[PDB]
Structures are given as C-alpha cells and as structure tokens.
Amino acid sequence: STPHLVNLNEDPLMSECLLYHIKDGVTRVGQVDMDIKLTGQFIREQHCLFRSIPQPDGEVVVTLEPCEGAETYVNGKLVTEPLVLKSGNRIVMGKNHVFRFNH
Ligand SMILES: [Cl-]
Ligand code: NI
C-alpha cells in the first residue's frame, strides 16, 4: 500500500490533521511552507522531511531526516541523523505531535 502517517494524539485540534499518505518523493514537515504543517511551540519552520524512494519490486522505502535544531524521536530515541523508518514506528515531533508510521 501507500505508507501512512497516522495521528496518535488523543485530542487533536479541529485544524489538526489526522492522517497523511506519504507519497513518492520528499514530504517536508514544519510550519512555514511545508507539505505537512504542524503548529506546536517546538515545531521548527523546517522540522524534518520524509523521503519515499521505490525499490526494484515497486515496494517503497521511507526515510526520515531531522533538521538542525528540530527535535524528532522514533520509538523513543531522539533522531539526530537520517534513518530508515519501519511499519509500526512511533514518531514524535516537537513535544505535541505523535504519529505512527504505517506501511
Ligand atoms: Cl511541539
Ligand atoms: Ni491509505
């Protein structure tokens, strides 16, 4: 299937987005001029980005790259360099945005 980024927040705001499909290419996450806009106090203008790249068989590989000074955690570990995501991974951006990556 397409990879999904699913919003795990228990009380998401009306403006807040519950589910994104991660499309082929770069999805930029942040506040100012991004493909996914998150508003929390700790979300930087350019927070991080997803890369979706195809394999020989069509199956996709999604990586997450954090931006300088923008905190993101995958399964509890702060991610500081780019990282290949896996279905089930829990991603927190800033302190107020929790997702699951579902492939
Ligand atoms: Cl935040
Ligand atoms: Ni879907």
Curated annotation (Swiss-Prot):
It comes from the Eukaryota. Residues 27-94 form the FHA domain. Disulfide bonds: none annotated. Phosphorylated on tyrosine residues. It is found in: Cytoplasm, Cytoskeleton. Expressed in all tissues examined, with most abundant expression in heart and skeletal muscle. Motor required for the retrograde transport of Golgi vesicles to the endoplasmic reticulum. Has a microtubule plus end-directed motility. Monomer. Interacts with BICD2. Belongs to the TRAFAC class myosin-kinesin ATPase superfamily. Kinesin family. Unc-104 subfamily. It is linked to Spastic ataxia 2, autosomal recessive: A neurologic disorder characterized by cerebellar ataxia, dysarthria, and variable spasticity of the lower limbs. Cognition is not affected. This is Kinesin-like protein KIF1C. It comes from Homo sapiens.
